[PDB]
Amino acid sequence: MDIRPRLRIGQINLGGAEDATRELPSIARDLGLDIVLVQAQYSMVGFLAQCGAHPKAGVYIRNRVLPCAVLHHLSSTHITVVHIGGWDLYMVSAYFQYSDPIDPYLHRLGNILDRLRGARVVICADTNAHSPLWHSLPRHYVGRGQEVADRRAKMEDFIGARRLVVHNADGHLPTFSTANGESYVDVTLSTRGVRVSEWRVTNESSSDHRLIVFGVGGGGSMQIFVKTLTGKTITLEVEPSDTIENVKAKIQDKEGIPPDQQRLIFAGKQLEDGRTLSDYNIQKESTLHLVLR
Predict the structure, then answer these.
(1) Contact partners, residue 72, CB within 8 Å, separation at least 6
(2) Are residues 53 and 173 in the same domain?
(3) What is the top-level taxon of the source organism (predicted)?
(4) Would you say 30 and 9 are in contact if contact means Cβ atoms under 8 Å apart?
C-alpha cells in the first residue's frame, strides 16, 4: 500500500497563476508529496480544498483516499484548516496578504490554535514578513521601514506567545525570488513536539516562490526498520509500548503481508506477539528481521 513511513508535504505560493497551479499534480507525483499547502492559487481548478468566493489559501491532497476533513468553522479565504485523520494531526495553509495589516491574520490563527489546543498542528504560511528566525538577511528586516519592522515584530511575538517551532533550516534557497531580489517570507511552523524532517527549498515550481518540501509523522515517538532477506526495508513510526502484534498489523497495512505468516526477530530472538517493543529493548532506529513462514 505504501513505501514511506511519514507524510511528505509541499508548501507553495502559486502567484495566482493557472500554469503553476496546474503543474502541482505532476510535481506531487514526481516528489511523492501526499499534501501541498498552497497560497495564491488559481482557484478555478478542480483539485483544491479551498473556502470562499476568491480563495487565496487551499490544500491539494494528491491521494484522494487519504482521509482529509476541511474544518469549515476554522477556515476562510486566506486560512485553510484540515484534519488528516484519524489521530491528532491538523494542517493549516495561510496567506498573509502583503497589502493588509498582519494583525487580523494572527488573531484568526490564534483562535484556530485555541480550538486545537494540545493537537499536533503544522502551519504553512506565506507571511510576507522578514525575520532572522527563517533566515531572512539583515537587509530584508532592518532599514526597510516601520511596516516591515512591525510585521516582523508581530510575527515573532505570535510565535513566542504560542510556543510555535519554526522549521525553516539554514543554508537553503530563498523562498521568494523576483526582479527586486530574493527573500525569505514562507515559513513552516508547528506546535511543540511535531517531528518535521528533511525540510528543504526546491526549484520544482514555475512560481516566483519556491516550493518547500518536508516530512511529518503520525505522532510516533520512534522509527524502527523492518528488514526482509531480499533487502526490502519497511520503515515504521512506532511507540515503545506498541506490541509485536500491533507492529505486524502495521506491516500488513504497508505490504499486505498477513500477520499470521509474519515472523519478527530481534537480537537473535523470535518476538512473541503478546509482548511490547520495550520488553525486547527495541529503541529508536533498531532493525527487526521479517521472515515469511
Answers:
(1) 51
(2) yes
(3) Eukaryota
(4) no
